Paper text:
Arap3, a dual GTPase-activating protein (GAP) for the small GTPases Arf6 and RhoA, plays key roles in regulating a wide range of biological processes, including cancer cell invasion and metastasis. PI(3,4,5)P3 binding is essential for Arap3 function, which drives recruitment of Arap3 to the plasma membrane to facilitate interaction with its GTPase substrates.
To understand how Arap3-PH1 domain recognizes PI(3,4,5)P3, we determined the crystal structures of unliganded and diC4-PI(3,4,5)P3-bound Arap3-PH1 domain, which refined to 2.1 and 3.3Å resolution, respectively.
Numbering used by the authors: 3 to 101
Write the structure that this text describes.
Amino acid sequence: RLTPLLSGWLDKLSPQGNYVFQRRFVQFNGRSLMYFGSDKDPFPKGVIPLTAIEMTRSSKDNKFQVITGQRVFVFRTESEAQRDMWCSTLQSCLKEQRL
């Protein structure tokens, strides 16, 4: 039962703002990816359950993409190694779910 904990401030692409990056507090506990407007907020602005994620992949310029059946969620980190850590953690959880 993979239960990592990653949390930190990431930039998240907002399509509702005509595709501009907005600061979010993000947390992945192995069951779901939650993003909050602030780490002080009780409730997240959005939640992606692991069961909804079909793929997570890296992209240019320190981005990773969480891809579901109908949607993509694009996050940007401060460094490449940080992006790798989020992407490979998500990939590992998805590999466990898949197997």
